[PDB]
Each structure stands twice: as structure tokens, then as C-alpha cells.
Structure 1
Amino acid sequence: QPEPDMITIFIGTWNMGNAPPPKKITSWFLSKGQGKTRDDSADYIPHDIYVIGTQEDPLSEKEWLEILKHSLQEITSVTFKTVAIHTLWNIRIVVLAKPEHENRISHICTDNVKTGIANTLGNKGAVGVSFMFNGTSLGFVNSHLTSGSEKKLRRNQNYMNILRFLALGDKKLSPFNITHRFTHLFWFGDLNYRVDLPTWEAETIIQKIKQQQYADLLSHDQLLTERREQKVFLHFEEEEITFAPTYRFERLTRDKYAYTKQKATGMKYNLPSWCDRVLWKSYPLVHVVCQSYGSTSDIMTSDHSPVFATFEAGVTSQFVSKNGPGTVDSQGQIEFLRCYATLKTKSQTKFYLEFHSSCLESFVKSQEGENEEGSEGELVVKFGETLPKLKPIISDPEYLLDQHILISIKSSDSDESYGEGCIALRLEATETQLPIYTPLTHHGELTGHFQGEIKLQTSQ
């Protein structure tokens, strides 16, 4: 029975509004309703992994697991295995997989982050799950960010706290936050970003939604605008939104948006908004294709509609050779030529690099680089031809060309990372000098760039 080189992943996010779900929620797992929907001809084909994020979830873990498993069994005639479930307050993540994957899944991690301080600490935050699927690392984050149209900056702060403090994936990757630890990272939830238009335009907005004319609304969506200005979710992707705003509905219909200020809303307007989102970030040159992104039309217990997204995602096998794992394969090497980091820092310490990769027995520290002044104020750290030759565990090009090198640039004075990035080994050529490049981030904000050349030797 061969190992897969692709899987499909279902991501669901639903703010349940503290209400039990209706008896049938299968449309959610089938990607049926509005937006980019799944073809009917696929309805019986199970996804490999289903990741369900809820917010304002009033159910016990047991109650929700029973509904989810019975839903999937009805659709697919497959009894899914529970990979992980984790709850913070009323924020929950469930991971289910086909039974055939049980012995492909390992290193399961769960964590949560509570956002805010005092007043603002007690119901918002995130839960997450990570695991290995054969040779591929997968991370999943369900966040419920701060509400309210005038709190986009708070949401952005909530995002940075979650990606700094959520402890998922390989703890040996110590310089790297969750935005660098996984082959594929999916981040979803009630992100709570709003359509920033004047209150007086509420009925105009509703009109536009009835005509399925979303362009002049999406141009004011705070998540799209904040992302464009590099304030949040830097280097993440989102599929085009082609479904109506998923908030705020009158319960038990979808015919009405309930936007007017009420005591129950803290006297805040809730203009129709795309609160409920799925984003992702995958390592460079790894296959990831969104095959659905939409909302259900027939699940009406909440003031939010469920959102679905599905993905084709490239995966690799758990590779064994005669040599690695357990030794190096002298027929393999990774060399770096003419490399330099450009950093936004005003500081003047020496810097060194760390190279981390599951193709190495352990991480590699470089010598200190040579600091120069850039012509526009910048710090340029030159490594020239000084970087160590990296010794992969396996030389087979079928393995090595699918790997990635994480790079941290660290202060000699403090050993703190000033920037993290990732280089793909999916090169156009081996035994050939080729340009490489990554942006560098720290706490998910841009801090610089790393560029140079690579020369990869495989056994072929």
C-alpha cells in the first residue's frame, strides 16, 4: 500500500453563538452553500484530515465529537479517528483523520494562548494542534480575536501574541515561531475583522450583499487592508472571498443581517462582515491548492454562518536509506556562496547564522558575519564564502530536493534571533550555483532579508 504524495485537508470555522447546532450540519463538511464550493461528484470522497475550529461553542468535547463523527460517517461511511481535541474556554479545535492514517500521524501537540490583560483576558485567544504526517509537519490554529469594528489594532496585537506564544511543533526549532515550524500552517477562526464603512451605509451594504456585489465591501475589509499594509498575517495566503458576509445574522433564518446597536451588543453596530476566515502559509515550492472556500446557507442556529475551506497539500514519505537516518550520507552537501543578510536593526552587535532542518542530524551554527553599512542606512551582514558546508542525512535527490533549510540570524551578544526565514531545496539544478532568497521576520514582522547562492550535491 503506497504512501501518499498528496492529501486533502478540510478546515472548518464556526462561531456557534453559544447555541447548540441543528440536527444536520453535513453541508459544512461537503463545502456546499455560497462561494467556491465543492463538486457534487466528490461528496462521497472523504478528506484525509478534517480540522474543525469552533468559537462560542456551548457543547462538551464529548457532545461535539459525537456530532462530528456521526456527520462524517453519514457522508463518507468512514469512522474517523480522533487525532486531537483541545478547548480554551469556548474556543475549540478537533482534528479527525481517516483510520488508514493512524500510523502515519505522530508527534501530536496541542496548546492555547489567552490574549489581552485583566479586562481583556478571559474569553479571547487561540487553540492549536500540530503533528507529523509521514515526512510532513502540519500546524493548525483556531483563534477568536477581539471583537468590534474599532479594534483592528487589538486584533493585530492578538495575532502577534498567538504566533509568539503558541508552543506547537518541534521544540528543537527554538529560534522559530509557529509561522516557520510547519510545512503547512492553517490559521482560521473568528478573526473578527470588519467591513470598515460608515454606520449610515448599513442598508446600502445589505443591498450590495443581496446583489452578490462584494467588490466595494471587500475593498473595506479590515483583514485584507491590514494584510496589504503588512500589519498582520505577513506571508500568509487567503483564497478570494466569493460568499456573502458570514456575520451578523438574525438566528433561524439567513434572510436578515442584524446590524443595529442593542444593549446585548454593548450599543455597538455590527455591519455585515467577513469575521470568519481561513488563511495558510506553506514552505516555499510545496504544493498547496485551495479547492473550496465558502459558507453554508442552511445552518442557522448561530448569528454566524459556518465557513469551510479545503486544500490539496503535498506530503512526503518517512525516508530511510542505507546511511541516514542515524548517520550522514557523504554523497550529499549544501553549500552557500556570496550570502548576506540585510537587517532593519539600529543595533551594532556581531551576528551569526543557525541552519535548522530535519535533513541535518542537528542544527549548524556559522561563524560571525562581517558588518557593513548599506547605502540607505541598513545593516548588511556579509558571510561571503565563509558559511559551513551542510551535511544531509540522506543524499537521494528524491528526498533532498523536497527539504527546506530554516535560517535564524542571531546576535553574538545576546544569542537572540533578529530574523527567521526559510529556503527551499527544490532547485532548478544540482551541482550548479543558483540564487536563493528569503525575507526575514521576527515575531512575524519583517526585519530584513537573506540572499545569496546555493550549490546542492545529491547522489544523482
Structure 2
Amino acid sequence: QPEPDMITIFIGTWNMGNAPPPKKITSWFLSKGQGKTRDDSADYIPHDIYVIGTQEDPLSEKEWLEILKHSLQEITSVTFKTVAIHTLWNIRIVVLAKPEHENRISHICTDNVKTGIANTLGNKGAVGVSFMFNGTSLGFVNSHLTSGSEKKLRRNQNYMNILRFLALGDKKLSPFNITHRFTHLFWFGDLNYRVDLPTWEAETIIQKIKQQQYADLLSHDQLLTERREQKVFLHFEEEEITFAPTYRFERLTRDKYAYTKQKATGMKYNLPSWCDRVLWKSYPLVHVVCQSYGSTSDIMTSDHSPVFATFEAGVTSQFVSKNGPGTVDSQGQIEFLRCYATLKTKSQTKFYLEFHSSCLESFVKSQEGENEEGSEGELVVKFGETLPKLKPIISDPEYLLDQHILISIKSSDSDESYGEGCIALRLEATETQLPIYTPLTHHGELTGHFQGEIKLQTSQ
């Protein structure tokens, strides 16, 4: 029974519009309909993991699990195992996996974040699941963000609150939020970003959709434009959108968008929009390939159409040698040369680095760097040659070149992280000085950069 080095992951997001689903939802899990769809020749091939995010979900967990399991069994003839299910209000995440993966999956976490204060705390937020799959950490977030075309800033704030406060993954990675804790992080949901065009243009927009001419609509998609201006989802990826806007439809057909202001909308227009989205962020130089991203055409109980995305995702095996785990492999070492952190902070305080990685017995604290001034006023923390030599638990290059080092730059005075980043050890060469780089973020906001050289020694 060989351990996989690749799995496929299905991500689904559906705002169910508080209505039970139709009797057949198989098209969703088959990635059929509009956009980048899955080849018919793959229909009987199960994905390894199915992650289902719903919003405005009127079903009990039991009712929805029974529908999902019966759907996958009908498609695949496989009885999928429940990894995790978590519900906040009407926001739900279900993770199903093939039974052969039961003993590959461990460290299952669930959490939720409620967004907003008083007025705004009551129905929006996120649920999430993480686990290990052999040597690979996987995180999944289903968020239902603030509605309304005029509230893109609120959505960006909701995103900020969710990535700060969602407690998934390894709690020993204390300086790191969910945007750094996982080999692969998938964030999906009713993100509620809208096509930001004048109200009077609604019929023009509908025309554009009927012509499958999305270019002029996507150029006004608030998620794409906010991402381009680095207001949200910094360092996340999204597949190109080639399907019609998934909101807001008249129920029981897909032929009609319902966009006009009504008492029930709070006298707001709902111009056709790509509310329903899947984004991801993987550690550098890990295999992740989007193999589908689209919407179904035949599921019409909601004012949203379901969205699907599928991924190839690189995974690693749970490595055991004669040495690690439980002792350093003295054959291996990670060295750092000419290392500098450039920070955006206006503060003048001493900094040190922490190195965190599952290839180390425990995190490593550096000595303090020496602060200098960049040309354009900036704080530059010099580490030069002073960073420690890291001693990985296993020196085998088949393990070590697949690993990553998380870096936090911490204030000596407060121990608060000013910036988090990640370095891949998937180098072009070993025993060779090679450039390294990571941006540094805090609360998912760009706070600086870390650059230098690495020199990696493996058993080879």
C-alpha cells in the first residue's frame, strides 16, 4: 500500500438561500456546468478529500451529511468517511475523505469566528477545519462575509478578523496565523464581493452574461480589484473565472437574474456578481494545480448557484529514519548568510527571529539583529552571518528538500511578531549558497521582507 505523493481535493461552496437542496446535486461534485469543468472520463474517479462549505444552510448536520454521502456513493460507489463537520449559525463546513485515508488523517481541528460588533454580530463569519494528511498540513475556511455592494471594506475587515482569530493547525506555531500554518490553505465561501458597476447598467450586465462576455464585468469584480490593490487575500491565488456570476438568480430557473431593489433586499440592488469563490495559498514550491473552477447549471433551489473547484495537491509521507523523529540527524544542517529583514514599522526597537518547522525538534530563537536605515527611510534589521545553524531531525534529502521554515521577526521588548513569512527548502542545489526571499506579513498585511542566502546540507 504505497503512500500518495499527490491527492485531489474537491472544494464546494454553496449559499443554499435557506432552502432544502434538490434531490440530485451530483453535478456539483462532478465539476459540471459552466467555467473550467472536469472531463467526463474522470466521473467515477473519487477525489481524495471533499470539503463542502454552505451558507444560509437550512439543514441539520445529520440531514446534510446523509445527502452528501448518498451523492458521493452514487457517483463513486465509495462510502466516504466524515473527517469533520462544523456549523456556526447557518455557515457549515463538511470534510469527507475516502475510507483508505482514515489512518493518514490526524490532528483534526475545527473552529469558527463571528465577525462584526453588536448590530453586525449575529449571522456572518467563518468556520474552518484543519488536519494532517501524512506529512502535509491542510486548512479549510468557509466564510460568509458581509453582504451589499457598498460594503467591500467590511468584507476586507471580516477577512482580517477571520485569519487572525480562527484557531486551526498547530498551536505551537504561536506567532503564525492560518495564512502560514498549512502546506495548503483553501479559503472559500460566499465572500459577497460584487460587480461594482452603476445600477442603471443592470440590463447591460445581463446582456454581457448572456453573451458569455465576462471581461468587462470581471474588471469591476470587487474581490479581484481589492486583491490587486492588496486590500484583502494577499498572497492567495484564484483560478481565472470563466463561468457566469453565481448570484442573484430567481429560484427554480437559471434563466433570470433578480437584481432590482426590493423591501426584502433592504432597497439594495444585487447586480449579478461572483459572490461565491474559492481561493488558496500553498507554501512556496509545493505542487498545487487547479483542475476545475466553475458553477453548476442544474441546481436552482437557491438564489446562488453552487461553485466547485478541484485541486491536485502535493503531499508528503510521515517520514521515519533510525535517527529522527526523537533525535537530530547530525548529517543535516541549514545555514543562513547575508540575511536582512526590511520592516515597514515606524517603531525603533530591537528584533530577533524565530525559525519554526516540523523538521526541527522545536522552534529556534536567533540573537538580536542590528538595526540600520534603508535609503528610503526604512528599518533594516541586519542578521548578516549571525543566524543559528538549524539542525533538522532528518537529513535525508527526500524529506528535507520538501520542508519549509516559517520565520517570525519579533520585538525583543514585547515578543510580538512584526512579520511572518515562509522559506521553501526545495532548493536548486545543496551545499551551495542560494538566494532566499519571503515577504513578511502580520494579520495578513504586508509588514516587510526577509532576504538572504541559504546553504542546505543533506545526507547526500
TM-score, normalized by the shorter chain, greater than 0.5: yes
Deviation at 1:118, TM superposition (A): 0.4
Deviation at 1:336, TM superposition (A): 0.2
SS at 1:330 equivalent: coil
Deviation at 1:211, TM superposition (A): 0.2
- 2:109 alignment counterpart: 109
In structure 2, how many angstroms separate the alpha carbons of the residues matched to 1:264 and 1:435? 57
1:7-56: CA deviation from partner (whole Å, max 9, x where unpaired): 00000000000000000000000000000000000000000000000000
- 2:235 alignment counterpart: 235
In structure 2, how many angstroms separate the alpha carbons of the residues matched to 1:249 and 1:345? 46
1:328-359: CA deviation from partner (whole Å, max 9, x where unpaired): 00000000000000000011110000000000
Deviation at 1:260, TM superposition (A): 0.3
Deviation at 1:202, TM superposition (A): 0.2
SS at 1:389 equivalent: coil
SS at 2:202 equivalent: helix
In structure 2, how many angstroms separate the alpha carbons of the residues matched to 1:437 and 1:251? 49
Deviation at 1:120, TM superposition (A): 0.4
In structure 1, how many angstroms separate the alpha carbons of the residues matched to 2:265 and 2:221? 21
- 1:223 alignment counterpart: 223
1:49-95: CA deviation from partner (whole Å, max 9, x where unpaired): 00000000000000000000000000000000000000000000000
Deviation at 1:218, TM superposition (A): 0.1
- 2:396 alignment counterpart: 396
SS at 2:366 equivalent: strand
Deviation at 1:108, TM superposition (A): 0.0
Deviation at 1:395, TM superposition (A): 0.4
State the TM-score, normalizing by the size of structure 2. 1.00
- 1:177 alignment counterpart: 177
Deviation at 1:224, TM superposition (A): 0.1
Q: Please, what is the CA RMSD of the aligned residues?
A: 0.2
Deviation at 1:183, TM superposition (A): 0.0
SS at 1:10 equivalent: strand
SS at 1:146 equivalent: coil
Deviation at 1:252, TM superposition (A): 0.2
Deviation at 1:181, TM superposition (A): 0.0
In structure 1, how many angstroms separate the alpha carbons of the residues matched to 2:156 and 2:183? 24
State the TM-score, normalizing by the size of structure 1. 1.00
1:89-121: CA deviation from partner (whole Å, max 9, x where unpaired): 000000000000000000000000000000000
Number of paired residues?
460
1:433 and 2:433 are equivalent in the alignment: yes
Deviation at 1:124, TM superposition (A): 0.1
Deviation at 1:240, TM superposition (A): 0.1
In structure 1, how many angstroms separate the alpha carbons of the residues matched to 2:319 and 2:58? 43
In structure 2, how many angstroms separate the alpha carbons of the residues matched to 1:448 and 1:152? 25
SS at 2:123 equivalent: coil
Deviating above 6 A after TM superposition, structure 1's stretches of 4 or more consecutive aligned residues are none
- 2:358 alignment counterpart: 358
In structure 1, how many angstroms separate the alpha carbons of the residues matched to 2:54 and 2:118? 24
In structure 1, how many angstroms separate the alpha carbons of the residues matched to 2:236 and 2:198? 28
* 1:59-208 superposed matches below 5 A: 59-208=59-208
Deviation at 1:187, TM superposition (A): 0.1
1:233-272: CA deviation from partner (whole Å, max 9, x where unpaired): 0000000000000000000000000000001100100000
Deviation at 1:159, TM superposition (A): 0.1
1:203-250: CA deviation from partner (whole Å, max 9, x where unpaired): 000000000000000000000000000000000000000000000000
Deviation at 1:127, TM superposition (A): 0.0
1:459 and 2:459 are equivalent in the alignment: yes
SS at 1:368 equivalent: coil
In structure 2, how many angstroms separate the alpha carbons of the residues matched to 1:397 and 1:323? 14
In structure 2, how many angstroms separate the alpha carbons of the residues matched to 1:266 and 1:340? 52
In structure 2, how many angstroms separate the alpha carbons of the residues matched to 1:194 and 1:258? 14
In structure 2, how many angstroms separate the alpha carbons of the residues matched to 1:374 and 1:37? 49
Q: Sequence identity, in percent? A: 100
In structure 2, how many angstroms separate the alpha carbons of the residues matched to 1:122 and 1:280? 27
1:146-170: CA deviation from partner (whole Å, max 9, x where unpaired): 0000000000000000000000000
Unaligned runs of 5+ in 2: none
1:402-455: CA deviation from partner (whole Å, max 9, x where unpaired): 000000000000000000000000000000000000000000000000000000
In structure 2, how many angstroms separate the alpha carbons of the residues matched to 1:277 and 1:197? 19
In structure 1, how many angstroms separate the alpha carbons of the residues matched to 2:373 and 2:398? 41
In structure 2, how many angstroms separate the alpha carbons of the residues matched to 1:421 and 1:377? 22
Deviation at 1:364, TM superposition (A): 0.2
In structure 1, how many angstroms separate the alpha carbons of the residues matched to 2:104 and 2:332? 27
SS at 2:367 equivalent: strand
In structure 1, how many angstroms separate the alpha carbons of the residues matched to 2:230 and 2:386? 33
